[PDB]
Ligand binder design. Structure first.
Ligand SMILES: *[C@@H]1O[C@H](CO[C@@H]2O[C@@H](C)[C@@H](O)[C@@H](O)[C@@H]2O)[C@@H](O[C@@H]2O[C@H](CO)[C@@H](O[C@@H]3O[C@H](CO[C@H]4O[C@H](CO)[C@@H](O)[C@H](O)[C@@H]4O[C@@H]4O[C@H](CO)[C@@H](O[C@@H]5O[C@H](CO)[C@H](O)[C@H](O)[C@H]5O)[C@H](O)[C@H]4NC(C)=O)[C@@H](O)[C@H](O[C@H]4O[C@H](CO)[C@@H](O)[C@H](O)[C@@H]4O)[C@@H]3O)[C@H](O)[C@H]2NC(C)=O)[C@H](O)[C@H]1NC(C)=O
Ligand SMILES: *[C@@H]1O[C@H](CO[C@@H]2O[C@@H](C)[C@@H](O)[C@@H](O)[C@@H]2O)[C@@H](O[C@@H]2O[C@H](CO)[C@@H](O[C@@H]3O[C@H](CO[C@H]4O[C@H](CO)[C@@H](O)[C@H](O)[C@@H]4O[C@@H]4O[C@H](CO)[C@@H](O[C@@H]5O[C@H](CO)[C@H](O)[C@H](O)[C@H]5O)[C@H](O)[C@H]4NC(C)=O)[C@@H](O)[C@H](O[C@H]4O[C@H](CO)[C@@H](O)[C@H](O)[C@@H]4O)[C@@H]3O)[C@H](O)[C@H]2NC(C)=O)[C@H](O)[C@H]1NC(C)=O
Lengths: 13, 208, 207
């Protein structure tokens, strides 16, 4: 899955 | 003669795949007689040639500032690769070599807790929302705040402090108008750190 | 030539009446050819003659460390008096002068708030109890913990951080065995700062 921060991609596994 | 300072990338840049982390090799006290500076970059002893020199900058104290920037790969930085900048200048008897890498040691996941304002603070015009971040290694971290999908800027965060168990902790304090707290508005603490799932967690706080 | 660093008193020394705060004039890189250092002390421009010189100390790098200590009066320090250490040595073309004093600006009383561990924090063997100290100026402060009249020493405290209103804040974190917290024991965050009543306050926390 993916992490987002204020509509910005942080990281996905 | 010239002095060299080699800086790591920003934690946010290393932890966000949508950002571009870079290491910076700064040379100061470069004379007007010999402004020519040569850089050699090495990634784990292996020379690389994709570095970029910034516009030369006059300092008006008789010296130039000369900067070389190297893009680094996210995983390379996080896997602990060493970056070496070798600086040569006519005023230097020998080349100056500096080295940076991520701090050594098994990464530890930050435990993130939000603490509401104390009852005793409820007389004030504004209240303190606390984000407590502990048990993290290495100390590279970013903390930010949000509400209603919008960033909240009225916060200050402590430097990381080395804890007795060898991890680090810090606190972030967001200051909000008391009414916003009383009205049930949800606030959120965002933490970016390598040992977190997807480099990220978000913890929420509202009046219960 | 040699280098001079002038140090303020420890905050706990200025804040406890029975303690003896002092300013410390450290001189480093003093040569073997001229180990003699003349000190002159000035309190608000007025020369004082009651400083003490510490034992001379050879490092290793073929340098001497020479230290002068001047005891400071509690009221003097609090009134913001300026302490000047002038250092003369033969390896110096000019006498080096340094000043320190308490940071200037109106003192502001800290607000001390104790914050209980989150529910999420209860899964582990030990828990962090939090003391938020904020709204204080100057940044000179001492924070300790206690329980049932006994000092609790298993805490770390952040440095003071400058806040957006120009005061300072910090957090201190005391780590206790979870069972002690579960069993209702009271823990106390104690804060020393000049703008507090009696330069002391204590706030309690329990489950
Ligand atoms: C002539 O003037 C120049 C310029 O000086 C400036 O102008 C004058 C007029 C005054 O106003 C000064 O106050 C100005 O600085 C003088 O050059 C200075 O020399 C100093 C050494 O003599 C040197 O000190 C060392 O600084 C290190 C930290 O530097 C940081 O932080 C300071 C602010 O605190 C900042 O000014 C520096 O530029 C530098 O800032 C970082 O820049 C890096 C590189 O760009 C950034 O990292 C990158 O950021 C980008 C995005 O921006 C991106 O994310 C990249 O991925 C990332 O890599 C980073 O963001 C910046 N950080 C911050 C916090 O802002 C200290 O660590 C170092 O201390 C160590 O060494 C000491 C020994 O000297 C030890 O005592 C100590 O224990 C430490 O081990 C030094 O103190 C100054 O940095 C330098 N100034 C500049 C601007 O470069 C020059 O000396 C003078 N010559 C003469 C003859 O007088
Ligand atoms: C030969 O060696 C000597 C000694 O070096 C040591 O031994 C060798 C073998 C090595 O192992 C070294 O690592 C050892 O340090 C060298 O002497 C050193 O010169 C340094 C460079 O000039 C100098 O750096 C400056 O340090 C300032 C802070 O000093 C603090 O902290 C350091 C490190 O933590 C510590 O080493 C110092 O002793 C000093 O500690 C404080 O002492 C004061 C005064 O006693 C304490 O205050 C008192 O506390 C008591 C409690 O008992 C009481 O309450 C009193 O009331 C109170 O006054 C205080 O608590 C101590 N604090 C701490 C944290 O420990 C820096 O501020 C300064 O940085 C700034 O300098 C410039 C400013 O313009 C800027 O460039 C820069 O940006 C900074 O702002 C300096 O870096 C070292 O202090 C000094 N070391 C010692 C031990 O004295 C010598 O240089 C070397 N020569 C050669 C040719 O190689």
């Amino acid at each position: 899955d993916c992490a987002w921060h204020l509509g910005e991609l942080v990281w996905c596994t | 003669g010239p002095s060299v300072f080699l800086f790591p990338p920003k934690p946010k840049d290393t932890l966000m795949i949508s950002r571009t982390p870079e290491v910076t090799c700064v040379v100061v006290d470069v004379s007007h007689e010999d402004p020519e500076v040569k850089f050699n970059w090495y990634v784990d002893g292996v020379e690389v040639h994709n570095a970029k020199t910034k516009p030369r900058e006059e300092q008006y104290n008789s010296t130039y500032r000369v900067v070389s920037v190297l893009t680094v790969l996210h995983q390379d930085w996080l896997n602990g690769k060493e970056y070496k900048c070798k600086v040569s200048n006519k005023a230097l008897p020998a080349p100056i070599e500096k080295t940076i890498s991520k701090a050594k040691g098994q990464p530890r996941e930050p435990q993130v807790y939000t603490l509401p304002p104390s009852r005793e603070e409820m007389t004030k015009n504004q209240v303190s929302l606390t984000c407590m971040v502990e048990g993290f290694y290495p100390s590279d971290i970013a903390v930010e705040w949000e509400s209603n999908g919008q960033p909240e800027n009225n916060y200050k965060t402590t430097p990381p402090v080395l804890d007795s168990d060898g991890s680090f902790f810090l606190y972030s304090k967001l200051t909000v108008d008391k009414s916003r707290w009383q009205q049930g508005n949800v606030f959120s603490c965002s933490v970016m750190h390598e040992a977190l799932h997807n480099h990220y967690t978000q913890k929420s706080l509202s009046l219960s």
